[model samples]
Target: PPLNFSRASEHRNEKGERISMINPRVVLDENGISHRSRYFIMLCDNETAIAHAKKTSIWAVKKDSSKRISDAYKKASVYFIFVAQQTYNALGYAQVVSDLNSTELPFWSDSSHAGGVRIKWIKTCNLFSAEISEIVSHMDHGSEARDGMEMMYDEGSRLCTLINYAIMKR
Candidate 1:
């Protein structure tokens, strides 16, 4: 069965439209707090608008610390690896991580202190560009040749704009 949003489901109507308190869910894990998933929903606009409602979703935490325990599932901790992978890839992974002392990229510890967020590098199993191109090639034959690329670009742009908003809010 598909994973439902647990307690949050009751608050929604027949159309899956939420009509009660803010959507929130428990962070649960069998291996202590180190491996728990926090569920939430925050409004954010999609690819069309500059600032819009985005549904806050569940995030799995991989690390635990006193700071984060007090921070209530900070975004830094939640999507650390995702952001790290993108940043590392953009900056050229080899050069970005080559020298420990000379690395100009900000560390997760530093970013956490600056904005109370966590950062981790999620390993990429395949090359990003190649994977994206392959996906585009395999898309529905009738779809526009550029539709996949456009979708990816839009998603990336919207994410950047969202992060910028988060940083600016901080």
Candidate 2:
């Protein structure tokens, strides 16, 4: 059975659209925390992002921490999708092993942008240029081909699947 946002059917927005990449059974614990069997994909552009995340065991975003990011980490596993800053090709992913929190760490010097999560890079898979093109070909926006940093993938979409598969494949 597919994982439900609550315990009913599917994780849907107000419009009732399905919102998960894969279907996995889920349930809420006694503390009212919902646990889902799924994974999330996060985009990383360059060495800066990698270094910071690795060095501090965290993934920091400029925006305020939201349910989308925190809930995903709390409810299910996550994968960090890497895009090479020089080549704009899909590099790979880093599996997340930590939960989301606002704990202050030494790495995040700026109090303005302190939202992030602790993570662990369990396993990674690198893809070649040819393989990257195969995945990019499925994207509707061709401009993303050259500008990987600005590109984003909606969770549970076809483009996400293509990119996830590329990261999962050896």
Candidate 3:
């Protein structure tokens, strides 16, 4: 995986917004070495990316017909993405309450979340960097994350782990 995982820094993105999180702007480099290693695969807790995710709590599911995409969404949706909740609805189904944004956040304007699933924020963790990766790396080797889109399970725990650390260390 040429996806160079590291502690992301605050910087201006393709849209000129000073943000931190993995997005299309950083997918490939000028020399084409994976878009200059656009960096910042890890989301910053204080940044809007994580906050936006938390704000809506609702994340879009894989609308595509590809079996791979749908399956991953189902596993991630249950195991990593959504959480079993008792609030919001009386139905016996899980709800969303985590940092679930594999969608292109840099282009937040065009992220195509119109077909979003209703979710509510569960106060547990936020999202971050080196300390973030330390605990995040504990995820099983089967986990794999693509740069821009695709919600990979390998890194799902990273965002969740980020939360664990936030509450655990605090």
Candidate 4:
């Protein structure tokens, strides 16, 4: 038997199709206020994008695509990481405390990305070049290069487990 978006069956780029709600499930935490646990891998256009996410405290994506992130799941607490296509690596991850724009005026002048979500980085994340392949190796069909944001899906927990230990070792 083969795996799916769950255990195995990891793949990249259907070429012409969109995988809707690929990984949209959430678990309810004890507080029960809402499901606050979720992880995401948002691949950015470049290194500056990750920088922008930190400097502004808001992670912006395409308005059309943000719909999936904004509405696909109910998340109050999320751990998301940024990936750079140019470097093909990611150093640190950020926490998205909330989703959507905070104020009506917008967070920054760079209106290139209209969809905005709140982001917060800890005091300091070990800034280093982490090979994307190394992280993806823990994911499904991760070996198949993907050009879109990972969105994490069900593979998030495994990814987080890796991050927890990997960060401490470095």
TM-score, one value per model: 0.19, 0.47, 0.34, 0.56
Candidates by lDDT, descending order: 4, 2, 3, 1
| Candidate 1 global lDDT | 0.25
Residue 87 shift from truth in candidate 2, angstroms = 2.5
Candidate 1 vs candidate 3: the lDDT winner is: 3
Candidate 3 residue 63 Cα shift, in angstroms, is: 7.5
Best by lDDT: 4
The deviation in Å at residue 95 for candidate 1 is: 21
lDDT for each candidate structure: 0.25, 0.45, 0.34, 0.48
Q: How many steric overlaps are in each model, in order? A: 14, 0, 7, 2
Clashes of 4: 2
Please estimate how well model 2 matches the true structure, expressed as its whole-model Cα lDDT.
Answer: 0.45
lDDT (10s digit) by residue, model 3, range 23-76? 534432222223111111222222443445556544443324123333434443
Indicate which candidate wins on TM-score: 4
Off by over 4 Å in 2: 1-39, 62-65, 105-114, 124-127, 133-170
TM-score of 2: 0.47
Could you list the CA RMSD of all candidates, in the order they appear? 17.0, 8.8, 15.2, 9.1
- Tens-place lDDT digits, model 4, residues 1-170: 11234422222234522222233233222211124455556655655656666667766655434555565335345666655544545545666666666352234425545456776774334333343345554443446334334334344454444455556766
Given candidate 4, what's the lDDT at residue 61? 55
Error of 1 at 118 (Å): 4.9
Against the true structure, candidate 3 reaches a TM-score of: 0.34
